[PDB]
């Protein structure tokens, strides 16, 4: 005769049983009986595991996930919360991976110039910049243009957003400006750099946020992010927010990556420098590349540094003493792009090639090549997906099956300047018939 093993077994044992079932089976079980429903909804592990299995969160990001879900659903419990999150996630991933699924497209006007120089995507805000010395802010939820920010006397080329609707910019205008989307104005104008601001990043140390800007003047000025508004500071010495200049590079500071009191910069002098912003001193000088660096990443988690040079190579450095760890050779052209996914180190080159290495041991995980061999202009990645763009090409790749999901979604685009995605929303600054546009794709 039968026996409701699930009800009769000790709680712990039944849960092992459920951990051997795919989510679909777990949902059906939830409707088998009142007790099954109760037993399953009692588990937090059940869903925590799944979320991680599907790469919707990582052990480190767990807690933060929880806090955010609790803010989203006060009256829900941790268990039911995690389940809502998973069910919501697994279905967006289902859409992304479905060849027969087509995202909803929204196309908005871009800048006066056909080229977009930069793009941020956070807090339901899509901010874009261009050589038309303008900054456009968009609404990613209602899919529409919000406002424009004007001020820079030169084309904008670097912009980083900061929680609260605050964002910082840098331009050929040689100034570093802080804006307030809410108020829609430039609340600060930091002068100093004796040349174009080429890159920038914002790091936080001891609950204090700092702005780090690299320039073609070979230096990196450090300013603290501020707590009639157009407050200009013609002089660094008198500027309360100024901190100092990191001198060391002999050429333009092309890239910058930081976290906490550690920032890493890449220059055209073919070198990289690890700075301790707190002590405002040089920590290590990474030498070896035989040509200019176009991108670097500071892997704080692992305490390392990835560098991409025009010398066609990628280098991994140990920031525990500054010595080289490995040299990756998977590109025959200039390697100007890099991203660190929770599971992958992804790199793209001027020959249209894209490589994915294991984020910890750097063994070859995947590699793609745009069919028309054109240089990779942009791309973004998650543990489940890769979106890449080049002239006449915009591709989405399912990183699990390794196969290409969609290849014609933005076919009418002539250039994919910047691409960024998060959850069910994908965004791209593109060019169509000598004009820029913002493309927003919906996968919900």
């Amino acid at each position: 005769l039968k026996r409701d093993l699930i009800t009769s077994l000790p709680f712990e044992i039944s849960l092992k049983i459920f951990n051997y079932l795919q989510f679909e089976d777990i949902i059906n079980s939830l409707g088998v009986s009142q007790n099954w429903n109760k037993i399953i909804r009692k588990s937090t592990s059940l869903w925590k595991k799944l979320l991680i299995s599907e790469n919707f969160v990582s052990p480190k990001g767990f807690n933060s996930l929880n806090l955010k879900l609790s803010q989203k659903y006060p009256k829900l419990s941790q268990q039911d919360r995690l389940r809502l999150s998973f069910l919501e996630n697994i279905f967006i991933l289902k859409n992304w991976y479905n060849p027969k699924f087509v995202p909803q497209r929204t196309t908005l006007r871009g800048h006066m110039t056909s080229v977009i120089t930069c793009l941020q995507f956070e807090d339901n805000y899509v901010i874009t910049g261009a050589d038309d010395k303008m900054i456009r802010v968009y609404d990613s939820i209602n899919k529409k243009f919000l406002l424009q920010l004007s001020g820079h006397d030169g084309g904008v080329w670097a912009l980083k957003y900061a929680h609260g609707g605050i964002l910082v910019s840098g331009s050929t205008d040689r100034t570093v400006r802080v804006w307030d989307i809410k108020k829609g104005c430039c609340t600060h104008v930091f002068e100093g750099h004796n040349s174009t601001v080429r890159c920038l990043d914002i790091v936080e140390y001891k609950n204090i946020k700092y702005i780090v800007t690299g320039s073609r003047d070979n230096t990196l000025h450090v300013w603290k992010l501020p707590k009639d508004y157009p407050l200009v500071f013609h002089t660094p010495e008198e500027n309360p927010y100024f901190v100092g200049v990191l001198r060391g590079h002999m050429a333009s500071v092309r890239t910058v990556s930081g976290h906490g009191n550690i920032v890493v910069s890449g220059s055209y002098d073919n070198t990289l420098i690890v700075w301790d912003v707190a002590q405002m001193k040089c920590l290590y000088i990474l030498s070896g590349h035989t040509d200019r660096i176009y991108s670097t990443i500071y892997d704080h988690e692992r305490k390392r540094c990835i560098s991409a040079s025009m010398d066609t190579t990628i280098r991994i450095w140990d920031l525990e003493n500054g010595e080289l760890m490995y040299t990756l050779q998977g590109h025959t052209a200039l390697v100007g792009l890099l991203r660190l996914s929770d599971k992958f180190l992804v790199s793209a080159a001027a020959d249209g090639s894209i490589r994915g290495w294991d984020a910890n041991d750097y063994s070859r995980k995947f590699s793609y090549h745009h069919t028309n061999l054109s240089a990779i202009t942009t791309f973004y990645v998650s543990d489940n997906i890769l979106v890449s763009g080049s002239e006449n090409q915009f591709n989405i790749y399912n990183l699990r099956s390794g196969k290409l999901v969609h290849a014609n979604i933005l076919k009418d685009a002539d250039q994919i300047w910047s691409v960024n995605f998060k959850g069910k929303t994908l965004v791209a600054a593109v060019e169509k018939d000598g004009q820029s546009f913002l493309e927003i794709l919906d996968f919900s």
Binding site: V115, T117, D131, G154, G155, S171, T172, T196
Partner: peptide, 4 residues
Amino acid sequence: LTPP
């Protein structure tokens, strides 16, 4: 993409 370099600035003018």
